[PDB]
Amino acid sequence: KQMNVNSSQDTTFEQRSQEKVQAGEINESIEFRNQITTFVHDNPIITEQLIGDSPQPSGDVRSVSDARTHSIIDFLERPQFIGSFLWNTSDIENKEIFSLKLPDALMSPMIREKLSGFTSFSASTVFHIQVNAHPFQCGRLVLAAVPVPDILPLHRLNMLSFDVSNVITLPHVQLDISKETEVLLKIPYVSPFVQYDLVTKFTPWAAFLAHVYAPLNTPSAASLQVNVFAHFEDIKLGFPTSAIVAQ
Amino acid sequence: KQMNVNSSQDTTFEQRSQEKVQAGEINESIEFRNQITTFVHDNPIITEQLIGDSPQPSGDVRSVSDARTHSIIDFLERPQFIGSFLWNTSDIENKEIFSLKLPDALMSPMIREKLSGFTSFSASTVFHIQVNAHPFQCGRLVLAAVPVPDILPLHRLNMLSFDVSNVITLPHVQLDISKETEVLLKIPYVSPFVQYDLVTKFTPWAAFLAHVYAPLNTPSAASLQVNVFAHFEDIKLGFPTSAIVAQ
Amino acid sequence: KQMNVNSSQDTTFEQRSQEKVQAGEINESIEFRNQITTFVHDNPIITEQLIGDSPQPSGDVRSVSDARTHSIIDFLE
Amino acid sequence: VGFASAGTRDIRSSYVEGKFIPQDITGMSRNHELDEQPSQECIGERILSFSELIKRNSWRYVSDEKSLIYPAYAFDNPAAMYTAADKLPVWTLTPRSGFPTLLTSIGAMYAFYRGGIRLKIVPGVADQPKPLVEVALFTMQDQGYIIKANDYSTDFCSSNIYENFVTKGIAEVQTPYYSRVNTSVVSAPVLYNAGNISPLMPNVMYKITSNSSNILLGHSAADDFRFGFLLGAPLAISATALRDNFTGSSATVSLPTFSNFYLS
Amino acid sequence: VGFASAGTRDIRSSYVEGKFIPQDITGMSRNHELDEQPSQECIGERILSFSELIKRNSWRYVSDEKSLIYPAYAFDNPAAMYTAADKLPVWTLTPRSGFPTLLTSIGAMYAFYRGGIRLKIVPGVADQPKPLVEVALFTMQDQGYIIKANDYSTDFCSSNIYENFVTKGIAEVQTPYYSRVNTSVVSAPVLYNAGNISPLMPNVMYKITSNSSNILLGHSAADDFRFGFLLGAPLAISATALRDNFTGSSATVSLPTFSNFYLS
């Protein structure tokens, strides 16, 4: 079967090989699978093609196909520009530049289209914070990660908003705008749920936050854009389902 | 770089290895690729993770992940119930049960979501026509395929609607409702375009049609549903693009 | 250097090989001589020519050049 | 290794993992190299992990019910209020599941946990005629994961342990993890609707019954317990300052300790 | 190889010589690696050099003289004028030696050339009684290197070729380089005083004679011809736009093509 059949089984005599069935029925039938659907036929079938059938030769598509290939995992691993946040001279120590939930912040139409059809997924996540200050500007940011933000005790979330000291104890990386151009933090998937529920959205596994560690310091008022790029890694997909990836 | 970097290159001394550049600039910088995005950094960067970082262990997800894996190609290969068409005793020789364009008829939200992000694709196609008549009913259908339907000369399309004899000369398979339960026809991708244009939709590469070959013959008026299942095979994808998969 | 350079020296790391200088400056620069002039460059330079550059072939000038050569000494003699 | 650098070098993970090694101000690493003599001569032990400390039991809550439903895996700590206003008590604590213990105080630094716990019970009265205490695994799906007097009279065939306040004096229990997941959330939120089926904590509570009018409950980690994902210092106040009375009102804060419990 | 650099890296000669190799935006060089299938399946040939194109003949000039002196190695192109003013023809072309051909159009991109050329002649009339055409090498030192009706009646013993418009139909000639130098100048300037002795072009012209009242002349490179020292795009206009007539005046520009020539 050149019908790219995943498996095929003529079941005509199957009833004749059951131990507790005697003189079993001989019933012309065949079962075959194509990906997630199995066809169980209860009579003969005919499988036809073009005379001398040959699939389209691979060389024909070089004019348009990418030499690189792209699967669902590949799409989820693509860097995405997640946002551009304002940082200015008036922001003081610990001012929040941004706080982005995971996955949430990466659930663009590109990612949603590819996750559609799965119950869930889990992944490590890499965040880049980029700042382009000119040489006469100084300042410092902290990019940190906190787990299961929507179910963490309030005292903990408050501590993060009260004092940057509680952000520095978290897994984090620091950005000195006069020395580094970009800084990255990779966080593995950690949660009571083995994968993130795309159907009920019950519970984002982490949040990445960026707070001012030392204010943007310039001779006159100024502001800079703090940009975020992110992508998933160590991706694990769920199970095929008709459930909608919730908005 | 455990940042699942596809490639990485410290370019600090790159300018020192150009033949026509003398005393080239030593410039701390690094370039790395993640899937389809390349980051070209013009200064030092810091890459941080959890202390003793370990990605989520695979065994943790067995409770939800499918032992089978699913990529874009896998999704496009999934059988789909394309339609249920009426066939009744009053239909005479050559009456058209259906005519479905390719891809068009298979462009369900599931397929569109997975093709989104590609300029185009090409594939062989397998069609199943299924009919469930009871033993006291007889009749016969023809499932045939015709290429580039929207650009074929009108005389040809008319010939198909005028006489079933012009359907029988085409690549086709016949269904005897009293003998076979289902019948399949596989057609390779053939077209002046090396892949189907998802952006401009310019030109469906084929159409599958089912015509009455011998009328449904029963003692009193009756009707049967003629069902269609289809899926793609020998799939070839296009190039990454932001162009919209046209409605 | 096909720039008929009499001598050439990349001096980028020169300050790093002075005995009484510690942690010397790494400074992209190059020095080269052409006859009685020495160019001391304090940054990168680019040296370009025709694609597949080839100087005029000697045979081309036989119609006018003297098989004998003439230098300053020759003229004074 | 070098005292200074142009750009960040002291990175959180690199230092803890031993990849970044700061130099001693004296230049001799021997000055901050471990010396075992002090602990061996002066202390008599050497603690290396909070894993050891949480295995020590501490008092959590005082009950005035003879039969009680208690939220075993709830690790929340009290709400606190402060004031320096005249004639008002300086500090006030309002518990939900109980007061802080080594288990919940160390736990407040982390996001997750897994493993079992242990329970200890001191009786207010060891009643000779009715000396038994029963601690039963409580699993009704309907019950909220909160403290409540027992009103159930239909929880047959439960897992029960019996201890005797007269022949022994203190009840000792070990609770299995019995979780639907492998990673639980420290002080997960408990809700009205919730009941006892949330995946964020083992779906198991205690039903404690005795003839003592009051009991003092305490706990600790079992041998397979662990906290994971360090967050940092939890919101906290000075324990010693709870004796403050500078407003003119006498301090009224009182933690559940054996002496507070046993004597009135 | 690296997408960016601090300082110039993409240098004109380095790229053409293959020393500088830019990276594909996709990171896979295979995406811009030569594929021979397209030309083999769709075209049937694969052109690699303008050397091939200039060997194809194209029409250069129409003469209304029966005997003509023609500037063989003059590769100049017409002067052009444009206007969008009402009722005036949009484009006008004024030739000197002729209109553009593959030879002169490709040549306009270079400064120099060397080698011979070929001449093709189509007759306006193939006169049966006097069917011959003579193409003679013309070398009078006095003649200006320009088009002129033949007034000479004393140019004996010239190099002559004869072709027959009736038995064959098109005259075909090959002209040797016959140059005083090894490098000629494309469209060198021709002057009043000049004559036919300048070293910038072969000192040779054509004297064409037949009994046809009109002839159409065309040319191409001979097998030993070459252009050298690429300069860039020459001053040029859109050929298709020559049909413009938006000013209300009908287009009057007409290039020398067989159809224009043969029919009126």
PDB file of N, CA and C in Angstrom, chain E residues 22-98:
ATOM      1  N   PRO E  22      29.409  36.578   1.338  1.00  0.00           N
ATOM      2  CA  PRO E  22      28.272  36.918   2.193  1.00  0.00           C
ATOM      3  C   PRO E  22      27.419  35.714   2.585  1.00  0.00           C
ATOM      4  N   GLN E  23      26.837  35.797   3.771  1.00  0.00           N
ATOM      5  CA  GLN E  23      25.999  34.736   4.295  1.00  0.00           C
ATOM      6  C   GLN E  23      24.551  34.880   3.836  1.00  0.00           C
ATOM      7  N   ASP E  24      23.913  33.749   3.558  1.00  0.00           N
ATOM      8  CA  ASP E  24      22.512  33.746   3.161  1.00  0.00           C
ATOM      9  C   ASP E  24      21.662  34.143   4.384  1.00  0.00           C
ATOM     10  N   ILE E  25      20.602  34.919   4.176  1.00  0.00           N
ATOM     11  CA  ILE E  25      19.769  35.316   5.304  1.00  0.00           C
ATOM     12  C   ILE E  25      19.239  34.095   6.070  1.00  0.00           C
ATOM     13  N   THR E  26      19.097  32.954   5.396  1.00  0.00           N
ATOM     14  CA  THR E  26      18.591  31.726   6.023  1.00  0.00           C
ATOM     15  C   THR E  26      19.689  30.925   6.711  1.00  0.00           C
ATOM     16  N   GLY E  27      20.940  31.320   6.513  1.00  0.00           N
ATOM     17  CA  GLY E  27      22.031  30.584   7.122  1.00  0.00           C
ATOM     18  C   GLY E  27      22.418  29.303   6.376  1.00  0.00           C
ATOM     19  N   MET E  28      21.698  28.950   5.313  1.00  0.00           N
ATOM     20  CA  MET E  28      22.013  27.744   4.548  1.00  0.00           C
ATOM     21  C   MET E  28      22.443  28.188   3.146  1.00  0.00           C
ATOM     22  N   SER E  29      23.738  28.110   2.865  1.00  0.00           N
ATOM     23  CA  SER E  29      24.259  28.521   1.561  1.00  0.00           C
ATOM     24  C   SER E  29      23.609  27.762   0.387  1.00  0.00           C
ATOM     25  N   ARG E  30      23.123  26.561   0.662  1.00  0.00           N
ATOM     26  CA  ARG E  30      22.443  25.747  -0.334  1.00  0.00           C
ATOM     27  C   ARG E  30      21.287  26.554  -0.990  1.00  0.00           C
ATOM     28  N   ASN E  31      20.670  27.457  -0.231  1.00  0.00           N
ATOM     29  CA  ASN E  31      19.591  28.279  -0.772  1.00  0.00           C
ATOM     30  C   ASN E  31      19.982  29.234  -1.914  1.00  0.00           C
ATOM     31  N   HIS E  32      21.284  29.490  -2.115  1.00  0.00           N
ATOM     32  CA  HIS E  32      21.722  30.335  -3.233  1.00  0.00           C
ATOM     33  C   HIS E  32      22.838  29.646  -4.026  1.00  0.00           C
ATOM     34  N   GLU E  33      22.830  28.323  -3.963  1.00  0.00           N
ATOM     35  CA  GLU E  33      23.795  27.498  -4.677  1.00  0.00           C
ATOM     36  C   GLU E  33      23.177  27.176  -6.050  1.00  0.00           C
ATOM     37  N   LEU E  34      23.996  27.216  -7.094  1.00  0.00           N
ATOM     38  CA  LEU E  34      23.511  26.962  -8.440  1.00  0.00           C
ATOM     39  C   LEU E  34      22.775  25.636  -8.639  1.00  0.00           C
ATOM     40  N   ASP E  35      21.647  25.721  -9.332  1.00  0.00           N
ATOM     41  CA  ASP E  35      20.789  24.582  -9.652  1.00  0.00           C
ATOM     42  C   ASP E  35      20.690  24.582 -11.191  1.00  0.00           C
ATOM     43  N   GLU E  36      21.160  23.523 -11.837  1.00  0.00           N
ATOM     44  CA  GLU E  36      21.128  23.479 -13.297  1.00  0.00           C
ATOM     45  C   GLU E  36      19.847  22.962 -13.915  1.00  0.00           C
ATOM     46  N   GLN E  37      18.986  22.381 -13.088  1.00  0.00           N
ATOM     47  CA  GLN E  37      17.742  21.821 -13.577  1.00  0.00           C
ATOM     48  C   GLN E  37      16.854  22.831 -14.314  1.00  0.00           C
ATOM     49  N   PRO E  38      16.668  24.036 -13.751  1.00  0.00           N
ATOM     50  CA  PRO E  38      15.815  25.013 -14.443  1.00  0.00           C
ATOM     51  C   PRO E  38      16.176  25.302 -15.894  1.00  0.00           C
ATOM     52  N   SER E  39      17.446  25.591 -16.176  1.00  0.00           N
ATOM     53  CA  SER E  39      17.812  25.895 -17.557  1.00  0.00           C
ATOM     54  C   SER E  39      17.646  24.672 -18.450  1.00  0.00           C
ATOM     55  N   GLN E  40      17.994  23.502 -17.929  1.00  0.00           N
ATOM     56  CA  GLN E  40      17.870  22.272 -18.713  1.00  0.00           C
ATOM     57  C   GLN E  40      16.446  21.850 -19.042  1.00  0.00           C
ATOM     58  N   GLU E  41      15.519  22.153 -18.137  1.00  0.00           N
ATOM     59  CA  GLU E  41      14.128  21.775 -18.317  1.00  0.00           C
ATOM     60  C   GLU E  41      13.250  22.824 -18.947  1.00  0.00           C
ATOM     61  N   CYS E  42      13.560  24.093 -18.696  1.00  0.00           N
ATOM     62  CA  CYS E  42      12.709  25.181 -19.166  1.00  0.00           C
ATOM     63  C   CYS E  42      13.210  26.047 -20.282  1.00  0.00           C
ATOM     64  N   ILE E  43      14.518  26.278 -20.313  1.00  0.00           N
ATOM     65  CA  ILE E  43      15.097  27.182 -21.299  1.00  0.00           C
ATOM     66  C   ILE E  43      15.704  26.473 -22.484  1.00  0.00           C
ATOM     67  N   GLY E  44      16.600  25.525 -22.218  1.00  0.00           N
ATOM     68  CA  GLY E  44      17.228  24.775 -23.297  1.00  0.00           C
ATOM     69  C   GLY E  44      18.637  25.247 -23.601  1.00  0.00           C
ATOM     70  N   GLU E  45      19.072  26.262 -22.867  1.00  0.00           N
ATOM     71  CA  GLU E  45      20.407  26.811 -23.027  1.00  0.00           C
ATOM     72  C   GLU E  45      20.685  27.586 -21.756  1.00  0.00           C
ATOM     73  N   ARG E  46      21.929  27.987 -21.608  1.00  0.00           N
ATOM     74  CA  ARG E  46      22.306  28.761 -20.451  1.00  0.00           C
ATOM     75  C   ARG E  46      23.394  29.756 -20.859  1.00  0.00           C
ATOM     76  N   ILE E  47      23.023  31.029 -20.964  1.00  0.00           N
ATOM     77  CA  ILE E  47      23.966  32.067 -21.377  1.00  0.00           C
ATOM     78  C   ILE E  47      24.887  32.465 -20.226  1.00  0.00           C
ATOM     79  N   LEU E  48      26.191  32.481 -20.473  1.00  0.00           N
ATOM     80  CA  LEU E  48      27.127  32.834 -19.422  1.00  0.00           C
ATOM     81  C   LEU E  48      27.893  34.127 -19.604  1.00  0.00           C
ATOM     82  N   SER E  49      27.908  34.663 -20.821  1.00  0.00           N
ATOM     83  CA  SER E  49      28.693  35.860 -21.085  1.00  0.00           C
ATOM     84  C   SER E  49      28.113  36.756 -22.152  1.00  0.00           C
ATOM     85  N   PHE E  50      28.356  38.058 -22.027  1.00  0.00           N
ATOM     86  CA  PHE E  50      27.882  38.997 -23.037  1.00  0.00           C
ATOM     87  C   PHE E  50      28.657  38.770 -24.336  1.00  0.00           C
ATOM     88  N   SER E  51      29.754  38.038 -24.215  1.00  0.00           N
ATOM     89  CA  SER E  51      30.565  37.657 -25.356  1.00  0.00           C
ATOM     90  C   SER E  51      29.671  36.851 -26.318  1.00  0.00           C
ATOM     91  N   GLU E  52      28.758  36.062 -25.759  1.00  0.00           N
ATOM     92  CA  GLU E  52      27.849  35.275 -26.581  1.00  0.00           C
ATOM     93  C   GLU E  52      26.806  36.173 -27.249  1.00  0.00           C
ATOM     94  N   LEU E  53      26.215  37.079 -26.484  1.00  0.00           N
ATOM     95  CA  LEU E  53      25.190  37.953 -27.027  1.00  0.00           C
ATOM     96  C   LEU E  53      25.663  38.869 -28.150  1.00  0.00           C
ATOM     97  N   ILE E  54      26.883  39.404 -28.064  1.00  0.00           N
ATOM     98  CA  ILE E  54      27.312  40.324 -29.115  1.00  0.00           C
ATOM     99  C   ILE E  54      27.665  39.641 -30.421  1.00  0.00           C
ATOM    100  N   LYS E  55      27.658  38.310 -30.430  1.00  0.00           N
ATOM    101  CA  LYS E  55      27.945  37.585 -31.659  1.00  0.00           C
ATOM    102  C   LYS E  55      26.651  37.436 -32.455  1.00  0.00           C
ATOM    103  N   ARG E  56      25.523  37.818 -31.845  1.00  0.00           N
ATOM    104  CA  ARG E  56      24.215  37.821 -32.521  1.00  0.00           C
ATOM    105  C   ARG E  56      24.128  39.149 -33.295  1.00  0.00           C
ATOM    106  N   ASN E  57      23.667  39.109 -34.537  1.00  0.00           N
ATOM    107  CA  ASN E  57      23.570  40.319 -35.354  1.00  0.00           C
ATOM    108  C   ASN E  57      22.326  41.138 -35.078  1.00  0.00           C
ATOM    109  N   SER E  58      22.439  42.453 -35.226  1.00  0.00           N
ATOM    110  CA  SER E  58      21.299  43.351 -35.039  1.00  0.00           C
ATOM    111  C   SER E  58      21.439  44.523 -36.009  1.00  0.00           C
ATOM    112  N   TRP E  59      20.318  45.148 -36.351  1.00  0.00           N
ATOM    113  CA  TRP E  59      20.342  46.231 -37.325  1.00  0.00           C
ATOM    114  C   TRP E  59      20.774  47.569 -36.760  1.00  0.00           C
ATOM    115  N   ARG E  60      21.651  48.208 -37.522  1.00  0.00           N
ATOM    116  CA  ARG E  60      22.297  49.446 -37.136  1.00  0.00           C
ATOM    117  C   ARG E  60      21.935  50.723 -37.881  1.00  0.00           C
ATOM    118  N   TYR E  61      21.751  50.618 -39.185  1.00  0.00           N
ATOM    119  CA  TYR E  61      21.544  51.819 -39.962  1.00  0.00           C
ATOM    120  C   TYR E  61      20.905  51.549 -41.308  1.00  0.00           C
ATOM    121  N   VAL E  62      20.137  52.518 -41.787  1.00  0.00           N
ATOM    122  CA  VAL E  62      19.501  52.403 -43.088  1.00  0.00           C
ATOM    123  C   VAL E  62      20.102  53.459 -43.996  1.00  0.00           C
ATOM    124  N   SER E  63      20.577  53.048 -45.162  1.00  0.00           N
ATOM    125  CA  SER E  63      21.149  53.987 -46.111  1.00  0.00           C
ATOM    126  C   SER E  63      20.273  54.125 -47.341  1.00  0.00           C
ATOM    127  N   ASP E  64      20.220  55.340 -47.862  1.00  0.00           N
ATOM    128  CA  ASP E  64      19.431  55.646 -49.058  1.00  0.00           C
ATOM    129  C   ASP E  64      20.389  56.021 -50.224  1.00  0.00           C
ATOM    130  N   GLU E  65      21.666  55.690 -50.057  1.00  0.00           N
ATOM    131  CA  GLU E  65      22.694  55.931 -51.060  1.00  0.00           C
ATOM    132  C   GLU E  65      23.051  54.600 -51.723  1.00  0.00           C
ATOM    133  N   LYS E  66      23.271  54.587 -53.033  1.00  0.00           N
ATOM    134  CA  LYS E  66      23.653  53.337 -53.689  1.00  0.00           C
ATOM    135  C   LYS E  66      25.116  52.994 -53.402  1.00  0.00           C
ATOM    136  N   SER E  67      25.936  54.024 -53.202  1.00  0.00           N
ATOM    137  CA  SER E  67      27.348  53.820 -52.884  1.00  0.00           C
ATOM    138  C   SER E  67      27.641  54.697 -51.669  1.00  0.00           C
ATOM    139  N   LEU E  68      28.069  54.046 -50.601  1.00  0.00           N
ATOM    140  CA  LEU E  68      28.254  54.692 -49.314  1.00  0.00           C
ATOM    141  C   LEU E  68      29.585  54.421 -48.620  1.00  0.00           C
ATOM    142  N   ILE E  69      30.102  55.416 -47.904  1.00  0.00           N
ATOM    143  CA  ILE E  69      31.319  55.234 -47.110  1.00  0.00           C
ATOM    144  C   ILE E  69      30.724  55.117 -45.696  1.00  0.00           C
ATOM    145  N   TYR E  70      31.028  54.038 -44.983  1.00  0.00           N
ATOM    146  CA  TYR E  70      30.454  53.835 -43.655  1.00  0.00           C
ATOM    147  C   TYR E  70      31.531  53.553 -42.583  1.00  0.00           C
ATOM    148  N   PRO E  71      31.468  54.248 -41.419  1.00  0.00           N
ATOM    149  CA  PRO E  71      32.399  54.131 -40.275  1.00  0.00           C
ATOM    150  C   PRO E  71      32.245  52.825 -39.472  1.00  0.00           C
ATOM    151  N   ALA E  72      32.871  51.781 -39.996  1.00  0.00           N
ATOM    152  CA  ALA E  72      32.831  50.448 -39.433  1.00  0.00           C
ATOM    153  C   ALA E  72      32.975  50.309 -37.917  1.00  0.00           C
ATOM    154  N   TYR E  73      34.039  50.868 -37.360  1.00  0.00           N
ATOM    155  CA  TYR E  73      34.266  50.740 -35.934  1.00  0.00           C
ATOM    156  C   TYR E  73      33.727  51.863 -35.048  1.00  0.00           C
ATOM    157  N   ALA E  74      32.770  52.638 -35.552  1.00  0.00           N
ATOM    158  CA  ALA E  74      32.155  53.718 -34.764  1.00  0.00           C
ATOM    159  C   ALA E  74      30.989  53.093 -33.979  1.00  0.00           C
ATOM    160  N   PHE E  75      31.060  53.124 -32.654  1.00  0.00           N
ATOM    161  CA  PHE E  75      30.029  52.481 -31.835  1.00  0.00           C
ATOM    162  C   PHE E  75      29.121  53.427 -31.073  1.00  0.00           C
ATOM    163  N   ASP E  76      29.031  54.665 -31.538  1.00  0.00           N
ATOM    164  CA  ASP E  76      28.201  55.666 -30.877  1.00  0.00           C
ATOM    165  C   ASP E  76      26.715  55.364 -30.981  1.00  0.00           C
ATOM    166  N   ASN E  77      25.949  55.917 -30.054  1.00  0.00           N
ATOM    167  CA  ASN E  77      24.509  55.725 -30.050  1.00  0.00           C
ATOM    168  C   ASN E  77      23.813  57.070 -30.241  1.00  0.00           C
ATOM    169  N   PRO E  78      22.526  57.064 -30.596  1.00  0.00           N
ATOM    170  CA  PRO E  78      21.812  58.324 -30.828  1.00  0.00           C
ATOM    171  C   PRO E  78      21.665  59.293 -29.675  1.00  0.00           C
ATOM    172  N   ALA E  79      21.469  60.557 -30.035  1.00  0.00           N
ATOM    173  CA  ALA E  79      21.206  61.626 -29.075  1.00  0.00           C
ATOM    174  C   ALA E  79      19.686  61.573 -28.886  1.00  0.00           C
ATOM    175  N   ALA E  80      19.228  61.797 -27.665  1.00  0.00           N
ATOM    176  CA  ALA E  80      17.802  61.715 -27.399  1.00  0.00           C
ATOM    177  C   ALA E  80      17.250  62.966 -26.752  1.00  0.00           C
ATOM    178  N   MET E  81      15.986  63.260 -27.040  1.00  0.00           N
ATOM    179  CA  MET E  81      15.324  64.404 -26.420  1.00  0.00           C
ATOM    180  C   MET E  81      13.975  63.938 -25.916  1.00  0.00           C
ATOM    181  N   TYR E  82      13.548  64.519 -24.803  1.00  0.00           N
ATOM    182  CA  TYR E  82      12.280  64.165 -24.191  1.00  0.00           C
ATOM    183  C   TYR E  82      11.472  65.399 -23.872  1.00  0.00           C
ATOM    184  N   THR E  83      10.155  65.282 -23.974  1.00  0.00           N
ATOM    185  CA  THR E  83       9.287  66.386 -23.594  1.00  0.00           C
ATOM    186  C   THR E  83       7.900  65.874 -23.285  1.00  0.00           C
ATOM    187  N   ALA E  84       7.224  66.561 -22.376  1.00  0.00           N
ATOM    188  CA  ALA E  84       5.869  66.189 -22.013  1.00  0.00           C
ATOM    189  C   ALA E  84       4.941  67.332 -22.410  1.00  0.00           C
ATOM    190  N   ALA E  85       5.494  68.289 -23.149  1.00  0.00           N
ATOM    191  CA  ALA E  85       4.743  69.450 -23.617  1.00  0.00           C
ATOM    192  C   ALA E  85       3.710  69.069 -24.662  1.00  0.00           C
ATOM    193  N   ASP E  86       2.552  69.708 -24.596  1.00  0.00           N
ATOM    194  CA  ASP E  86       1.480  69.412 -25.526  1.00  0.00           C
ATOM    195  C   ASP E  86       1.796  69.465 -26.998  1.00  0.00           C
ATOM    196  N   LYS E  87       1.257  68.480 -27.702  1.00  0.00           N
ATOM    197  CA  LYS E  87       1.389  68.352 -29.136  1.00  0.00           C
ATOM    198  C   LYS E  87       2.785  68.126 -29.713  1.00  0.00           C
ATOM    199  N   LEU E  88       3.774  67.913 -28.855  1.00  0.00           N
ATOM    200  CA  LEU E  88       5.128  67.621 -29.325  1.00  0.00           C
ATOM    201  C   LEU E  88       5.396  66.122 -29.165  1.00  0.00           C
ATOM    202  N   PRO E  89       6.147  65.510 -30.093  1.00  0.00           N
ATOM    203  CA  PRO E  89       6.421  64.071 -29.941  1.00  0.00           C
ATOM    204  C   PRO E  89       7.226  63.883 -28.639  1.00  0.00           C
ATOM    205  N   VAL E  90       6.827  62.903 -27.830  1.00  0.00           N
ATOM    206  CA  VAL E  90       7.461  62.680 -26.537  1.00  0.00           C
ATOM    207  C   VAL E  90       8.956  62.401 -26.586  1.00  0.00           C
ATOM    208  N   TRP E  91       9.360  61.513 -27.488  1.00  0.00           N
ATOM    209  CA  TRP E  91      10.764  61.166 -27.622  1.00  0.00           C
ATOM    210  C   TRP E  91      11.258  61.428 -29.030  1.00  0.00           C
ATOM    211  N   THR E  92      12.504  61.870 -29.172  1.00  0.00           N
ATOM    212  CA  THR E  92      13.077  62.020 -30.503  1.00  0.00           C
ATOM    213  C   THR E  92      14.517  61.491 -30.404  1.00  0.00           C
ATOM    214  N   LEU E  93      14.941  60.776 -31.437  1.00  0.00           N
ATOM    215  CA  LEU E  93      16.281  60.216 -31.496  1.00  0.00           C
ATOM    216  C   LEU E  93      16.991  60.761 -32.724  1.00  0.00           C
ATOM    217  N   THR E  94      18.245  61.156 -32.557  1.00  0.00           N
ATOM    218  CA  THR E  94      19.040  61.684 -33.657  1.00  0.00           C
ATOM    219  C   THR E  94      20.343  60.906 -33.712  1.00  0.00           C
ATOM    220  N   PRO E  95      20.440  59.978 -34.656  1.00  0.00           N
ATOM    221  CA  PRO E  95      21.646  59.160 -34.783  1.00  0.00           C
ATOM    222  C   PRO E  95      22.795  59.863 -35.448  1.00  0.00           C
ATOM    223  N   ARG E  96      23.990  59.337 -35.202  1.00  0.00           N
ATOM    224  CA  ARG E  96      25.194  59.826 -35.848  1.00  0.00           C
ATOM    225  C   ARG E  96      25.575  58.619 -36.739  1.00  0.00           C
ATOM    226  N   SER E  97      26.192  57.588 -36.168  1.00  0.00           N
ATOM    227  CA  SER E  97      26.585  56.417 -36.959  1.00  0.00           C
ATOM    228  C   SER E  97      25.492  55.372 -37.095  1.00  0.00           C
ATOM    229  N   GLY E  98      24.450  55.473 -36.284  1.00  0.00           N
ATOM    230  CA  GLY E  98      23.378  54.499 -36.362  1.00  0.00           C
ATOM    231  C   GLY E  98      22.617  54.348 -35.061  1.00  0.00           C
TER     232      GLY E  98
END
